[PDB]
């Protein structure tokens, strides 16, 4: 399933939901903006 809003994520590897995109100078999913 898709990472959610606050889920740990790899910055080279998007796995967050639609509309939420791992941060690159982050480490979770934040609202894709």
């Known amino acids: ?3 959610k809003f606050g ?4 910055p ?3 796995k967050c939901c639609s ?4 941060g690159s100078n982050h480490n979770w ?4 903006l």
């Open 1 to 3: 399933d898709c990472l």
């Open 7 to 10: 889920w740990k994520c790899n």
């Open 12 to 14: 080279r590897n998007d």
């Open 19 to 22: 509309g939420l995109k791992c």
């Open 29 to 32: 999913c934040k609202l894709h």
